[PDB]
């Protein structure tokens, strides 16, 4: 777990120092740069991710867990904790992705999709309980807050 912190430190240096090297060569009147400076749609991470370097793909906080025995895919050697073999995508969205990087990116995206799809039964019941418990409260004329009874 010490090694994981050093690798997630070093692989976040590559994304940040590669994404601060694309924003120094973009001219003004670039369209995503204008749309990120005015805050309308987008951010700097999106520009630096579809120009320079897509970041480390993380499923629930850590690197890509092993699905097979002691490795992530059959395409990598066993017990290897390399950057590329556990979810780091060295390419951007301009130069395309490789098959293992595309599969890891899809693993990282399906978690967002399934949290969006699980959230609906996760929150509305809680709001139903809060409304059925709180709805009798009313600020009165003598500046109190009293219940129904």
């Amino acid at each position: 777990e010490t090694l994981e912190a050093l690798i997630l430190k070093e692989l976040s240096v590559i994304r940040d120092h590669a994404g601060s090297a694309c924003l120094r060569e973009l001219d003004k009147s670039n369209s995503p740069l204008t749309m990120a400076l005015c805050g309308s749609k987008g951010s700097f991470i999106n520009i630096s991710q579809m120009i320079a370097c897509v970041g480390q793909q993380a499923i629930s906080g850590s690197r890509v867990p092993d699905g097979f025995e002691n490795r992530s895919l059959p395409h990598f050697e066993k017990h290897s904790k390399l950057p590329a073999a556990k979810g780091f995508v060295a390419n951007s969205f301009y130069s395309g992705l490789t098959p293992t990087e595309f599969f890891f990116h899809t693993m990282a995206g399906r978690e967002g999709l399934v949290d969006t799809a699980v959230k609906t039964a996760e929150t509305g019941y809680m709001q139903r309980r809060l409304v059925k418990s709180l709805e009798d409260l009313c600020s009165q004329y003598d500046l109190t807050v009293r219940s129904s009874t």
Binding site: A58, S60, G61, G112, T116, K119, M126, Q127, L130, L134
Partner: protein
């Protein structure tokens, strides 16, 4: 904000450990007001907060320390006149861990919820060895119960609090100072407020039931306010304090 929280990652309370339930299940655990929750934390402040030598004494004073974790070899000895179990305390690792335990303390830690062994059955022949002569339990048990105590006696506690799972010394980063707070993943607030060396006037908790049982209803109200507002802040949301105040 329950629909807005994507149940995000990267949350460790700044220690790269001590995983905490945040997001929608944290608000769910607060408003359900249950008696026991996953991942409790009792954050304690130390009074003489200058040096780490003071912090590890009170760390070992509350953390669960097992007898099998301080004994170098635990053996049965069969004899032509007797049979017993012999435990030699590795006193070097007692001296390094800075603990208040010797053979007379281990004798007192035995006879607390173990098979009803008698205090006469346990002797203190040296300053390390502690022999336990077994008896007949006589309630669905044979005298060959030495195999029960051979794996059961290393699960008795000699120093610390029984409910605390683990603990970690936590530091700050600011340049003005360097002081040592204490993160206790446990479920006994009254025990951490009572050990010598822990500033009991300034320690808190996550679980509202322990705060209600120890400090009262008004501190439980303040804990509900602070914890709902902390969970809402850690996910990029912002609620005026009058709403969480009305809920509490």
């Amino acid at each position: 904000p329950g629909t807005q929280m994507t149940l995000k990652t990267f949350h460790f309370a700044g220690v790269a450990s001590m995983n905490i339930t945040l997001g929608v299940p944290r608000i769910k655990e607060i408003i359900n007001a249950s008696k026991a929750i996953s991942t409790p934390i009792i954050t304690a402040q130390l009074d003489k907060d200058d040096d780490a030598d003071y912090a590890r004494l009170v760390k070992g004073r509350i953390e669960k320390t097992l007898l099998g974790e301080i004994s170098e070899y635990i053996e049965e000895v069969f004899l032509p006149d007797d049979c017993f179990i012999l435990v030699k305390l590795s006193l070097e690792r007692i001296r390094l861990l800075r603990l208040e335990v010797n053979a007379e303390t281990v004798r007192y830690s035995i006879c607390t919820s173990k098979l009803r062994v008698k205090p006469g059955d346990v002797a203190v022949h040296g300053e390390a060895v502690v022999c336990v002569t077994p008896r007949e339990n006589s309630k669905s048990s044979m005298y060959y119960v030495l195999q029960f105590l051979k794996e059961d006696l290393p699960k008795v506690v000699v120093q610390g609090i029984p409910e605390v799972s683990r603990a970690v010394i936590h530091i700050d980063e600011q340049s003005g100072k360097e002081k040592y707070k204490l993160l206790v993943e446990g479920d006994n607030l009254r025990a951490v407020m009572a050990t010598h060396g822990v500033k009991g006037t300034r320690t808190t908790s996550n679980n509202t039931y322990e705060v209600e049982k120890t400090l009262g209803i008004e501190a439980a109200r303040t804990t509900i306010i602070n914890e709902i507002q902390y969970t809402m802040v850690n996910h990029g949301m912002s609620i005026d304090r009058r709403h969480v105040m009305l809920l509490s």
